[PDB]
Amino acid sequence: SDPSSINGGIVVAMTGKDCVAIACDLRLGSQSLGVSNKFEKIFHYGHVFLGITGLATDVTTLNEMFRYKTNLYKLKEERAIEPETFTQLVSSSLYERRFGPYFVGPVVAGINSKSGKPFIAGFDLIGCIDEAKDFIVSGTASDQLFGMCESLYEPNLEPEDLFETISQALLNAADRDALSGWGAVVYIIKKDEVVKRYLKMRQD
């Protein structure tokens, strides 16, 4: 009965040279039972990308909530929300439920359309912002991801090289976690193009 490890799953985000990458596994289970291998944990609102790990009902609920809020933001502001602004919105929304929190580990990723600066961020379940140049990790194999990212990561990687680093970080972390894996998706995000790749991995 630990909300953060009932459904399982992982998200990882990295920065590169004029680009960012965000990736996640596809597993959704009920403890030992694998239920779905199509459960994507990454969503996007305009050009800002959001990955969410943890309790699957909250993953879905928060996606619907941030879609709701970014749509109203766009109508009123007459422009798409930026990653820095969205990060603050995620934090505010999570802390609003301080004593009844969503059991999640969100990860923001994106490129600022004005400055062109690659941006990533992470949060704890009550909204504490973890800003980072290098990488952000989340989920039931976060320890494994921290180890993989710390050793494999280097600064200023090109989109094609960054893809290999983030993919290998996720895959090998997932294979050392029982509640993660069952497929994987990787988003490579450039200033004005986004490539989505499904990875081949072991299905156990």
Binding site: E64, M65, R67, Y68, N71, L72, L75
Partner: protein, 244 residues
């Protein structure tokens, strides 16, 4: 007590009319004319700005045409401040529906709910009604392209082509004359501007005194696009039809 100063906004006249609704409609008749025309492959929204000043910032301005969501837009006729209250409510309602059903809100459902809010102010609460008439232009996968209007009474009706605001009598006659069912968007654009040009209280119809918008399926393959016209784009479409 306070009874002495109560205007009683929600009562019937001896003739069976709602005073405040009728007087709100009288207010709306002095507002800049707004026209909506529905074609087989899109919808046009055209509206006349209220006596423009030369020093008014025209490009970063929004008086008549507002966006409710990606598929639905409204043209306003009446008190702008009142309209914005209702517009924000409508925007929220559309998102509540999308959150609940994971589907974009059908046009009529949004129109009905906004019209029900207006109705409430005429029956209870003791407050003045909203001095606003909307033209709703939108698309959904059930009824396709749709035009509606609502007024302070909270009554709404569907239309092929309709005008609100000033000179609606003259405007509706001109629309009834030239409109036909197999009409295209480009033709409807021309009809809208021609109608405003004849009904306007101004000397000549110009780009700076207009707001314009279209809702086409002109995007790539089976999807709707909302185009709120820029000042230069209105200038171009006005020349292209041969008004200026």
């Amino acid at each position: 007590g306070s009874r002495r100063y109560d205007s009683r906004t929600t009562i019937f006249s001896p003739e069976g009319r709602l005073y405040q609704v009728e007087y709100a409609l009288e207010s709306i008749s002095h507002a800049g004319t707004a026209i909506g025309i529905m074609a087989s492959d899109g919808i046009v929204l055209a509206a006349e700005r209220k006596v423009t000043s030369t020093l008014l910032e025209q490009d970063t301005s929004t008086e008549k045409l507002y966006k409710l969501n990606d598929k639905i837009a409204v043209a306003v006729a009446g008190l702008t401040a009142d309209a914005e209250i209702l517009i924000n409510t409508a925007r929220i309602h559309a998102q509540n529906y999308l959150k609940t059903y994971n589907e974009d809100i059908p046009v009529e459902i949004l129109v009905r709910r906004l019209s029900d809010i207006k109705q409430g102010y005429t029956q209870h609460g003791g407050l003045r009604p909203f001095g606003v008439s909307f033209i709703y232009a939108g698309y959904d996968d059930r009824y396709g392209y749709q035009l509606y209007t609502s007024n302070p009474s909270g009554n709404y009706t569907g239309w092929k082509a309709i005008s609100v605001g000033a000179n609606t009598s003259a405007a509706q006659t001109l629309l009834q004359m030239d409109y036909k069912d197999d009409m295209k968007v480009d033709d409807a654009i021309e009809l809208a501007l021609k109608t405003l040009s004849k009904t306007t209280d101004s000397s000549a119809l110009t780009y700076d005194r207009l707001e314009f918008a279209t809702i086409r399926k002109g995007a790539n393959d089976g999807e709707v696009y909302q185009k709120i016209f820029k000042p230069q784009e209105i200038k171009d479409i006005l020349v292209k039809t041969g008004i200026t």
